[PDB]
Write a protein that binds this ligand. Structure first.
Ligand SMILES: O=c1ccn([C@@H]2O[C@H](COP(=O)(O)OP(=O)(O)O)[C@@H](O)[C@H]2O)c(=O)[nH]1
Ligand SMILES: O=c1ccn([C@@H]2O[C@H](COP(=O)(O)OP(=O)(O)O)[C@@H](O)[C@H]2O)c(=O)[nH]1
Ligand SMILES: [Cl-]
Ligand SMILES: [Cl-]
Ligand SMILES: [Mg+2]
Ligand SMILES: [Mg+2]
Ligand SMILES: [Mg+2]
Ligand SMILES: [Mg+2]
Ligand SMILES: [Mg+2]
Ligand SMILES: [Mg+2]
Lengths: 289, 288
């Protein structure tokens, strides 16, 4: 047993839930004045965005205080379908007028920090085929009930992806081995506190998830990170060209957080902490005494 | 930088090698060629691979060796029947205790061979073609300044496209021109191979590629198409362990601190030293 194994074992005991079965009523009662914003990033998801919004809508006015689709420049019917399904639709330009947009998912999530007011922000992908209504309660459970948790990663069980298992987890094993305890570090369903999310830079495009995970870990360690089982979902097939581009950006973002230079050979920049434009900051763990 | 890749492809990459065996034999000019097949429990395929190379023995090829990596099946007996000399890891380098992995096997073969050119061919190949060795040694014999030839297959793998090529893009960007940097069929000069450390296990190919690039340059590397072959579907658990070691070896060659922590997998950051440090007199005898 290695030091990584030992930490993983205890981290799973304290910070991982295979059955995150908190009730909505219990979570509402735990808010204690805190508010919850749910953000769906969306670029051309007309076939699925309404279905995702529809699974979250029953929580509006209770557990969830706002439900926003942050549109990324869609040209299909994404925006109007999200409206009819009951979401608030905000463009990248309206979310943060003073900064010109650049492409990619990371830009959308970063801008959503300026468009939301919740003390807890939940991100859910708008391309999900089978969203489940309990996603949001499961993701916010540890933030509302567990001392010291600032980031919650939702993972799926598989029926009994390649970038995660060949790129992200092996690179974390090399560079930040304690983080190999996180089952799906690239997953798009996760939640965080405003205090954390406003204080960290946002990586562009496909790098935003891994960047947030390492930035959280480097400031607060394993104690601040939790994970919850959202249910059983089969892997979807993505073209190898897409996976290679995702891998290249995961590498670039991991390298930038871990002190490894990157050629830039494949143009998008990291965005600074939103508290430089709209933001009490997050207290890091002390490295001195 | 696309121009750099473009220039290299036109001079150092062959999609359709024209060379005949007779042409290559005439060009040897006193150089000798050793062919080494690493083998660990390959009883079903090692004979078929050896049989495709044996007709060259005594002509283009001066020795044909299967370096047995501790097999417990009929690998050794079937390799001898097909015409190869079988050499164990212990015999190849007796005073150094063996450690597991393919890199160990290829490194040790340097002490058991005499060729000015050494050709490595995997013993698990299902459809070996008799022109593999001729195509691999073509650029070494007929071009100037080439020291490492990488055999690639035209496709009709996930670790190459998701791990090796993107990491090279990040850390050795010129090397993304190499189509299949992890491929197990390749040839090198004695001068190169005797003088570089060998990475362990699954890292040996990428280690040799990067060390060759740094020490001798892009123009010392070539690649040749060995034919159309389909990707063999390996279990993702095997691919993950392979990826982890490719990462450790590239990090070792870049000075990135690698934890040495495996996947919950065997990973090593410890190279073997250049063989000319342990076999200095053999190495000097083979110079010039
Ligand atoms: O520039 C972008 C790219 C993606 N997305 C959204 O982010 C989620 C994850 O995107 P994905 O990684 O699937 O993008 P892909 O690889 O399909 O382009 C989906 O809900 C997309 O609609 C977005 O809002 N803006
Ligand atoms: O410790 C080892 C591992 C592999 N091999 C040989 O090296 C080649 C490439 O091995 P491969 O990567 O297929 O190994 P695997 O993934 O099957 O363990 C094959 O001819 C194996 O027999 C070897 O001699 N020793
Ligand atoms: Cl993935
Ligand atoms: Cl591969
Ligand atoms: Mg999409
Ligand atoms: Mg528009
Ligand atoms: Mg998706
Ligand atoms: Mg703490
Ligand atoms: Mg084998
Ligand atoms: Mg093989």
């Amino acid at each position: 047993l290695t030091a990584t194994d030992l930490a993983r074992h205890r981290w799973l005991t304290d910070n991982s839930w295979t059955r995150p079965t908190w009730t909505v009523a219990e979570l509402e009662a735990a808010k204690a004045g805190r508010t919850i914003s749910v953000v769906l990033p969306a670029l051309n998801e007309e076939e699925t965005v309404g279905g995702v919004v529809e699974t979250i809508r029953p929580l509006l006015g209770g557990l969830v205080d706002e439900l926003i689709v942050l549109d990324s420049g869609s040209t299909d019917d994404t925006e109007i379908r999200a409206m009819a399904a009951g979401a608030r639709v905000i463009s990248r330009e309206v979310a943060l007028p003073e900064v010109a947009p650049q492409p990619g998912k990371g830009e959308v999530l970063w801008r959503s920090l300026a468009a939301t007011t919740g003390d807890i922000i939940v991100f859910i992908d708008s391309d999900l085929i089978d969203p489940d209504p309990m996603f949001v309660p499961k993701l916010v459970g540890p933030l509302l009930l567990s001392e010291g948790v600032h980031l919650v990663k939702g993972f799926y069980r598989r029926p009994l992806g390649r970038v995660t298992e060949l790129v992200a987890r092996p690179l974390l094993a090399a560079l930040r081995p304690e983080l190999t305890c996180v089952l799906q570090p690239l997953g798009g369903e996760y939640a965080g506190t405003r205090e954390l999310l406003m204080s960290v830079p946002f990586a562009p495009g496909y790098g935003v998830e891994i960047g947030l995970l390492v930035d959280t870990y480097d400031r607060l360690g394993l104690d601040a990170i939790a994970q919850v089982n959202l249910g059983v979902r089969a892997h979807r097939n993505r073209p190898l060209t897409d996976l290679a581009a995702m891998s290249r950006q995961v590498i670039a973002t991991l390298f930038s957080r871990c002190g490894v230079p990157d050629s830039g050979v494949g143009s998008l920049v990291d965005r600074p902490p939103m508290n430089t434009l709209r933001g009490a900051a997050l207290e890091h763990h002390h490295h001195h005494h």
